[PDB]
Design a binder for this molecule. Structure first.
Ligand SMILES: O=C(O)c1ccc(OC[C@H](C2CCCCC2)n2c(-c3ccc(Cl)cc3)nc3cc(F)c(F)cc32)cc1
Lengths: 12, 230
C-alpha cells in the first residue's frame, strides 16, 4: 500500500 | 569537453542535497568504537536504515523535475531504488580512507554483526568492486540520482518522463568521468555496469534482514514498506 512512503512524498 | 554553466549549477545543487546525509565518520566511528552483540547490531542497522530512507526521500524530492512526475511513478521510483541506494551509500562509507588497520577492523566487525554467511561474501565483493572504480564524491552523488531516476523500474507508467530527468544527470556524470579519469575511457561504462551488479545483489535484501542471527526481527512500519518485511 506504501502509505508511509506516500505520506512522506505528498507532505510540505 | 567541459561542464556548461547549467551543468555546474546542476552539479553543485545535487552535491548540496547529497551532503544532508550522515557523514561516513559518524557511521564508522560507531562500529569501530566497540563490539556489539548480534541483537544490538540488528537495532543499530534498523535505526540507520530508517534514517537512510527518510534522508533519501528528501534527496529525491529535490531532484529536478521529480515532483512534476505522476504520483504513482514517484512511489515506484522511490520503492524501486531505496535499497540499492542504501547499498551504494554503504559501498561509499566502506571505501572512505581510514587510519592503518581501521578498514580491516571495520570489515571484521561487519562480518561478525549477525548477518548470515551467505550474504557476507556477495556484500563485501560488491563494496570492493565499487572501491576499484576510485569514485569521487560527485560521482557517488550523481550515480545515486541516476539509480533513483531509473526509467526501467517495474510499475513505471511513463518511462519517457523519467528518461528526460535521468538524461542530464548521465551527461554530467559522463563529462566528470572524462575529467577525473582521462587515462581510463572505460570509467563511465564501468560505473553504469556496477549499477546492474547492484540490482542483482539487491535481490535478497529482505532475507539479509530476516536471516540476521537474532531470536526476533522487529522492524519499523516505514522499513516494512521499503524492505518488504513484516
Ligand atoms: O546513513 C546512511 O547513509 C547509512 C547507510 C548504510 C549504513 O549501513 C549500516 C550497516 C551496518 C549496521 C551495523 C551492523 C553492521 C552493518 N552497514 C552495511 C550494511 C547495510 C545493510 C545491510 Cl542489510 C547489511 C549491512 N554495510 C556497511 C558498510 C560500512 F562501511 C559501514 F560502515 C556500515 C555498513 C548505515 C548508514
Amino acid at each position: 500500500d506504501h502509505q508511509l512512503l506516500r505520506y512522506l512524498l505528498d507532505k510540505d | 569537453m567541459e561542464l556548461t554553466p547549467d551543468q555546474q549549477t546542476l552539479l553543485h545543487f545535487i552535491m548540496d542535497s547529497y551532503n544532508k546525509q550522515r557523514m561516513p565518520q559518524e557511521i564508522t566511528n560507531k562500529i569501530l568504537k566497540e563490539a556489539f552483540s548480534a541483537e544490538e547490531n540488528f537495532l543499530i542497522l534498523t535505526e540507520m536504515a530508517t534514517n537512510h530512507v527518510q534522508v533519501l526521500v528528501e534527496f529525491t524530492k529535490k531532484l529536478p523535475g521529480f515532483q512534476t512526475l505522476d504520483h504513482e511513478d514517484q512511489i515506484a521510483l522511490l520503492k524501486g531504488s531505496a535499497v540499492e541506494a542504501m547499498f551504494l551509500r554503504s559501498a561509499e562509507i566502506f571505501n572512505k580512507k581510514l587510519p592503518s588497520g581501521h578498514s580491516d577492523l571495520l570489515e571484521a566487525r561487519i562480518r561478525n554483526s549477525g548477518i548470515s554467511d551467505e550474504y557476507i561474501t556477495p556484500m563485501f565483493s560488491f563494496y570492493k568492486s565499487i572501491g576499484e572504480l576510485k569514485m569521487t564524491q560527485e560521482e557517488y552523488a550523481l550515480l545515486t540520482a541516476i539509480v533513483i531516476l531509473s526509467p526501467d523500474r517495474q510499475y513505471i507508467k511513463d518511462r519517457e518522463a523519467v528518461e528526460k530527468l535521468q538524461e542530464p544527470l548521465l551527461d554530467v556524470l559522463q563529462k566528470l568521468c572524462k575529467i577525473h579519469q582521462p587515462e581510463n575511457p572505460q570509467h563511465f561504462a564501468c560505473l553504469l555496469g556496477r549499477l546492474t551488479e547492484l540490482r542483482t545483489f539487491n535481490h535478497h535484501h529482505a532475507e539479509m534482514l530476516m536471516s540476521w542471527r537474532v531470536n526476533d526481527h522487529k522492524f519499523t512500519p516505514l522499513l516494512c514498506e521499503i524492505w518488504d518485511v513484516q
